[PDB]
């Protein structure tokens, strides 16, 4: 069993404690048009509810956020379809929740912690002289649908509220979808579209990853739940955008279950056929899931996936604890054996009593579920 504090990574201690905290929430009306600033050096896709850590030192970015704090506190994170020609049709708004200004080495620096809020549709990207861009965006509403049975049942059967619990789920299907007999589809078909059902199917995989998981940590709402799960699936950029386009929590959960079932091996994106890890080695060392976004000392965001065993990896250099994202663990650079692609890091415990004693931090940009 694991004795590491799963909460520790989510707090981004490497970013330093003693940060100005903001509480007040900003939310734009659905389908409403907005003009939001874009941080020039962010290239990661942000899913709503996901924590984005930043370490900004470019004067134009520092001044951008410093001004952003004085107002809205929200910026636009673009989901690039082609990162090279910097093409993006969708994105997510990020609201700063923790902020800190420092001055060191002749520069003004700022460290932020933002959170995904609202998905948007890019309407036009206008660029400012300072380098930072603005984005005319259209807020995409989250589409909440009622029970599959809500419409069909306007009757007496309405007041039938929702090991060994295996039979409860059977009694649940038989009961909740009894009115399917009035329709042209079976109760087992309606299950494939039931938020509670789809969620318990996902919760099944989440418990295979976090062996020490308590259901209270997980969101109850399928809207927050579909998004939390979306952000910890080590998938390619093309598939991630497809997931970000999804308007329904049901369509999202259904998508995630398909990805989860068809996922087997995780290879090196560069040589494509070199297997690095498998679905069975993934485990949640953080509360926000097996995979999460972290910042290196130069502001580059690495979405890293925690696995117990990795295969064709070569380490270089000796372990370091500098800027470690998992406190109590030292990291050593890991590359693909075949091509030399930087795959992430090997994390090793600094104390003999720690569990896990070793794990692997693999960046998703280096992986391919092929």
């Amino acid at each position: 069993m694991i004795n590491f504090d799963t909460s520790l990574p989510t707090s981004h201690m490497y970013l330093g404690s003693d940060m100005e905290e903001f509480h007040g929430r900003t939310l734009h009306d659905d389908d409403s048009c907005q003009v939001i600033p874009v941080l020039p050096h962010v290239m990661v896709m942000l899913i709503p509810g996901q924590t984005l850590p930043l370490q900004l030192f470019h004067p134009q970015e520092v001044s951008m956020v410093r001004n952003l704090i004085q107002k809205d506190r929200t910026f636009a994170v673009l989901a690039y379809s082609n990162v090279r020609e910097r093409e993006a049709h969708f994105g997510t708004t990020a609201e700063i929740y923790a902020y800190r200004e420092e001055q060191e080495y002749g520069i003004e620096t700022v460290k932020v912690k933002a959170i995904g809020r609202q998905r948007f549709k890019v309407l036009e990207i206008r660029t400012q002289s300072d380098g930072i861009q603005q984005a005319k965006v259209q807020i995409l509403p989250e589409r909440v649908l009622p029970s599959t049975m809500s419409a069909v049942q306007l009757q007496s059967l309405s007041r039938r509220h929702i090991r060994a619990f295996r039979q409860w789920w059977q009694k649940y299907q038989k009961r909740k979808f009894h009115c399917a007999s009035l329709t042209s589809w079976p109760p087992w078909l309606y299950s494939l579209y039931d938020a509670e059902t789809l969620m318990e199917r996902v919760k099944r995989q989440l418990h295979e990853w976090d062996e020490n998981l308590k259901d209270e940590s997980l969101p109850t709402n399928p809207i927050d739940f579909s998004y939390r799960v979306a952000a910890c699936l080590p998938i390619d950029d093309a598939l991630r955008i497809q997931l970000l386009k999804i308007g329904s929590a049901i369509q999202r959960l259904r998508c995630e279950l398909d990805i989860m079932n068809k996922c087997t091996s995780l290879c090196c994106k560069q040589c494509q056929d070199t297997e690095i890890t498998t679905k069975n080695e993934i485990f949640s060392l953080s509360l926000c899931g097996p995979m999460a976004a972290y910042v290196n000392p130069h502001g580059y965001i690495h979405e890293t996936l925690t696995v117990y065993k990795a295969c064709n990896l070569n380490l270089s250099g000796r372990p370091s604890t500098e800027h470690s994202w998992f406190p109590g663990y030292a990291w050593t650079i890991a590359q693909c054996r075949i091509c030399g692609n930087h795959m992430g890091w090997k994390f090793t415990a600094t104390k003999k009593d720690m569990s896990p004693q070793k794990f692997w931090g693999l960046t998703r940009s280096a992986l391919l579920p092929r």
């Binding site: 579209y193 199917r201 329904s248």
Partner: protein, 1091 residues
């Protein structure tokens, strides 16, 4: 695209029912909710009295009667699914009945999550308020003009059921609620003067884990009776009484009713149709009924069973059990088509005459329903007598009340038949001539008989049969036309008319006149409270083509209508429908004119023309179920009846009828003697209504249906529930269609507690008997069914798409496609193709088989070796539930409205994704309308229509039609129940048993009718004062948008029903080109002909 939607059949299913004194404080009333309809009745004690039927601009959710303090009768509260609230009072003044709004308003909240246990509408016993549970965490209060409302923060979020407690100083509500700890019953006191909740009279007592309903019991008892799965418990603070009867374990109690007003007896009803009596605690099983949605105790012993899954009922609760042991006996059955889970249009009987066979009901109430336009006849005798020119019934015995003689007329001859019970025999009535053609004969004044022939008027006595009087034209001329009642005779001799009176042993010539032109037809039917003496004579003339109302005896012209044309009036008739007097006049071209007639003045008003046939129509009056009707004999035989003081015309299912008369004999009671070109048939008429419904009970669930013409039979997918027996398998619950098959069979495996058993039934298109039943594999769930010809093969195969369903599995991993051949009264399995998923849908795609396997879409080729071969595949990422086609254009559908259009490239041998659309909403049905359009059913009882230079434009579909139907469509079907203004015809079947029709309109015809709708809505008074625009607004929990590209045919059709000055108001400045009211009558009439 612009469409027109109309109701072919109103919803049949019962949503709720109540008893009270709504009409008068004397009459016991039964109010039945059939969704958008409200049927109001009086308990006849010897039946059910139909008073009024009112339609509404909403789906009824809540329906509860109430009398607040001093009132002459009862006030009715109704709340719609769209949160329209109204208090309705009854108002009657003579033959004029009107429902009156007393208060109205929309109770919907700006925010809030609509509760899981649905809308709950309770009322305080003292009529102090209305309690509404529409949203979780709130309790809305309407203190019973604009229905002013307010909320109360209700702490316990998950409320199961709630009722207002009886006998309380301060109004109290008792509710079953669930929390993570468990399910507990609680009390709260609702304050109006403080607009808040305060601690209830008693403690939060813990109830059953599956406690479902609260039953508020009146004084002297008080408190509440909580009902669960295994237990029935009672709570009154420090008073408790917990019982767990085993008899209620099998099924959950879904509905109740109060029997004794004090609260000593309650009716209880489960999901299996078992009826229980909760006595004050003891429970006793009474018997079996239809699966009751709602129950109502009325009068003494009689119970109303309001069923949504099957035919509704009237049953008797006897004090003594019968031989079987049932204290329940069925009196009357009420046809319910709901739910329509699948259907098809088949030309059974006559080609061109479409019939609709549906998969109706569920479980033990499962049935087939055959819906055919027009009334039918039940033949009891058939006689070879060609060339009948007339039919008349006689009572040759004055001492007898029944017709024992039938008189037939032929070219220049008269034959007489005697009815010795069921035996028809050739005879000669003494006094009557057989060598002359008869124009009339019947029983007349002073125990006499009359015979009007081409030569004379003969008066015959009954004791004995002999000629007592005879009348002839003075120059021995021939009688041309003749009319006769009981005291009077009016005969034409070319242009001349003669008025005679029937006296004892005398035919007295009262008066005579000469007409302007030749006489064509005559009628002297006495109307109103005229004791067999008519002061009026209706006459049709040649050349001028006029219908004239003449006075008797003077022969004075009262009115003269110029019918217009070159076609002479052939038949004329004066009649009374629903106490309103009318004049009917039929022309030689099959056209029928019908006016209202003033008995005092003689004025013909409200001229209406209807096209009945191609041949001259003959009008004969007959009685059916103590109601006067008119049979219109032509090549399209029709019954002319009255419904809401408007004349209705329903067709008869007979090739042609030339002449008819009503025969009421000892052997043939309350019968109809009908004659065509070759034969005379004596029979009984069906129910006088537009559509006819034949019921084929299956006693199991019909799921799917299709038709094989080459086999003269239907393919029906059905399922029956069986229980796990103390053996290596299962046993049935009752005999059903799949068990009682003529010849039986089971599937042979080649692939690797209550059970659902699936079957393929084979039913003969005439008898409707289960010729064969093929039982599917254990755990095999049959999904899709198609009867087609594939490849080069000339044999029609019944194809079934299955899914192997296991509890552990969520999405079927296995499935089959099974090809069957129906030969020698037994299904022969041709091909068995195992697939890696569920076969949700299958369609015959240009000699190939298109079938969905979960997410994938497969095209199969049928080889000479007689087995399907995989051609091309399309992997969709969206479940292929819906699969519709037209040419090389394919529609793929998801339950969440994710539509995508595919195209098969023949030379490439692959699928091309034309367009896609993903806008999540629940979708129940979809059908392709044409090459560029498709129709569908969307969440919150709506209908939609999607349509088809740049790629990012052509690859996207646009939503052109949006309409709130108020019904849940399960099936769309191309066809018509009828034998140009509109394009196409798609029928639709709903959960409530409602059938509808969707047709296309032109751009300007749509605008004409849309403009007309806005004008009609300014005239028409809405029940509960709901705006029609609001009712038809495409509605979801999210958005409410006005209806687009759709015309409410039901609203358009009520133009023919509004007052004539109101029609003038609607058409005034309507239109650019001007529109006459006469132009708009024709257009609206033309639209009523589509259904």
């Amino acid at each position: 695209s612009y469409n027109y939607v109309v109701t072919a059949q109103k919803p049949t299913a019962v949503n709720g029912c109540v008893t009270g004194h709504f009409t008068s404080a004397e009459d016991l009333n039964l109010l039945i909710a059939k969704n958008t309809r409200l049927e109001i009745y009086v308990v006849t004690a010897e039946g059910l009295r139909p008073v009024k039927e009112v339609g509404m601009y909403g789906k009824i959710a809540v329906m509860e009667l109430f009398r607040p303090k001093g009132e002459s009768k009862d006030l009715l509260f109704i709340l719609t699914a769209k949160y329209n609230a109204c208090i309705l009072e009854y108002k009657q003044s003579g033959e004029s009945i009107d429902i009156i709004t007393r208060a109205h308003g929309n109770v919907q909240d700006r925010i809030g999550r609509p509760s899981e246990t649905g809308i709950i509408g309770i009322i305080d016993p003292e009529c102090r308020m209305i309690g509404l549970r529409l949203y979780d965490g709130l309790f809305k209060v309407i203190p019973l003009k604009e229905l002013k409302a307010f909320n109360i923060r209700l702490e316990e979020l998950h409320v199961i059921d709630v009722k207002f407690l009886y006998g309380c100083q301060a109004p109290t509500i008792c509710f079953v609620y669930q929390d993570p700890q468990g399910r507990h019953v609680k009390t709260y006191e609702v304050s109006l003067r403080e607009k808040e909740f305060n601690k209830g009279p008693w403690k939060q007592e813990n109830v059953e884990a599956e406690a479902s309903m609260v039953i508020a019991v009146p004084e002297p008892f008080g408190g509440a009776i909580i009902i669960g799965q295994e237990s029935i418990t009672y709570h009154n603070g420090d008073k408790y009484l917990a019982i767990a009867p085993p008899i209620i374990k099998q099924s959950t109690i879904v509905c109740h009713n109060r029997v004794d007003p004090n609260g000593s007896r309650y009716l209880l009803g489960d999901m299996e149709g078992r009826l229980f009596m909760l006595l004050l605690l003891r429970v006793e099983l009474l018997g079996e009924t239809s699966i009751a949605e709602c129950l109502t105790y009325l009068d003494n012993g009689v119970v109303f069973v309001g069923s949504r899954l099957g035919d509704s009922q009237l049953v008797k609760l006897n004090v003594d059990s019968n031989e079987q042991g049932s204290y329940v006996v069925a009196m009357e059955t009420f046809t319910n088509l709901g739910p329509i889970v699948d259907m098809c249009v088949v030309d059974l009987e006559r080609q061109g005459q479409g019939q609709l066979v549906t998969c109706s009901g569920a479980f033990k109430e499962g049935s087939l329903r055959i819906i055919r336009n027009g009334i039918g006849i039940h033949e009891h005798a058939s006689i070879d007598l060609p060339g009948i020119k007339g039919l008349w019934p006689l009572r040759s015995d004055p001492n007898r009340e029944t017709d024992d003689t039938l008189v037939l007329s032929f070219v220049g001859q008269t034959r007489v038949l005697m009815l010795n019970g069921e035996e028809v025999e050739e005879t000669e009535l003494m006094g009557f001539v057989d060598d002359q053609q008869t124009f009339f004969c019947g029983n007349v004044a002073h125990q006499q008989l009359i015979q009007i022939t081409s030569a004379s008027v003969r008066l015959v006595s009954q004791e004995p049969k002999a000629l007592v009087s005879e009348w002839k034209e003075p120059q021995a001329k021939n009688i041309s036309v003749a009319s006769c009642n009981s005291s009077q005779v009016v005969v034409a001799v070319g242009r001349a008319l003669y008025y005679l009176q029937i006296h004892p042993q005398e035919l007295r010539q009262i008066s005579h006149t000469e007409m302007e032109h030749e006489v064509a037809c005559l009628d002297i039917t006495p109307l109103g409270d005229s004791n067999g003496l008519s002061p009026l004579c209706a006459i049709g003339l040649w050349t001028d083509i006029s219908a004239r109302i003449l006075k008797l005896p003077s022969f004075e012209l009262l009115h003269k209508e110029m019918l217009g044309g070159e076609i002479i009036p052939r038949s004329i008739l004066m009649t009374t429908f629903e106490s309103s007097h009318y004049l009917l006049c039929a022309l030689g071209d099959g056209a029928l004119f019908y006016f209202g007639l003033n008995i005092e003045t003689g004025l013909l008003s409200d001229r209406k023309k209807v096209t009945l046939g191609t041949q001259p129509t003959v009008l004969r009056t007959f009685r059916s179920l103590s109601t006067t009707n008119v049979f219109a004999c032509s090549d399209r035989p029709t019954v002319i009846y009255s419904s809401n003081h408007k004349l209705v015309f329903s067709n008869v299912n007979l090739k042609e009828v030339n002449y008819m008369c009503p025969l009421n004999s000892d052997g043939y009671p309350d019968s109809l003697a009908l004659a065509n070109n070759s034969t005379l048939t004596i029979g009984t008429i069906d129910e006088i209504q537009k559509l006819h419904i034949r019921t084929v009970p299956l006693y199991e669930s019909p799921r799917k249906i299709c038709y094989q013409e080459v086999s003269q039979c239907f393919g029906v997918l059905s399922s029956r529930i069986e229980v796990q027996d103390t053996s290596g398998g299962t046993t049935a619950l009752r005999p059903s269609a799949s068990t009682q098959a003529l010849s039986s069979s089971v599937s042979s495996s080649k692939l690797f507690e209550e059970v659902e058993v699936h079957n393929l039934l084979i039913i003969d298109q005439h008898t409707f008997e289960v010729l064969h039943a093929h039982q599917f594999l254990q755990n095999e769930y049959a999904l899709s069914l198609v009867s087609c010809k594939l490849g080069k093969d000339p044999n029609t195969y019944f194809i079934v798409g299955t899914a192997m369903v296991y509890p552990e599995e969520a999405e079927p991993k296995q499935g089959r496609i099974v090809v069957f051949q129906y030969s020698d009264g037994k299904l022969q399995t041709v091909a068995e193709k195992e697939v890696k998923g569920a076969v949700y849908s299958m369609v015959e795609f240009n000699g190939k088989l298109l079938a969905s396997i979960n997410s994938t879409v497969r095209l199969y080729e049928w080889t000479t070796e007689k087995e399907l071969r995989t051609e091309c595949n399309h992997y969709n990422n969206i479940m292929a539930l819906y699969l519709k086609t037209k040419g090389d254009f394919i529609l793929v559908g998801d339950l969440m409205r994710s539509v995508l259009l595919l195209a098969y490239k023949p030379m490439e041998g692959n699928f091309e994704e034309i367009a896609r659309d993903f806008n999540p909403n629940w979708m129940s049905a979809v059908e392709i309308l044409d090459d560029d359009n498709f129709l569908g059913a969307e969440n919150a009882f709506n209908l939609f229509v999607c349509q088809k230079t740049t790629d990012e434009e052509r690859q996207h579909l646009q939503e052109v039609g949006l309409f709130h139907l108020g019904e849940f469509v399960n099936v769309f079907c191309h066809g018509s129940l009828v034998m140009t203004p509109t394009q196409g015809s798609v029928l639709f079947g709903t959960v409530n048993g409602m059938i509808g029709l969707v047709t296309s309109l032109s751009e300007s015809w749509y605008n004409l009718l849309l403009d007309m709708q806005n004008r009609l809505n300014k005239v028409i008074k809405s029940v509960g004062k709901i705006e029609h625009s609001f009712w038809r607004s495409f509605h979801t929990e999210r958005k409410t948008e006005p209806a687009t590209g759709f015309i409410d045919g039901d609203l358009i059709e009520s133009f023919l029903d509004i007052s004539r000055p109101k029609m003038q108001e609607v058409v005034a400045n309507l239109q650019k080109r001007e529109a006459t009211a006469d132009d708009l009558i024709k257009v609206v009439e033309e639209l009523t002909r589509i259904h």
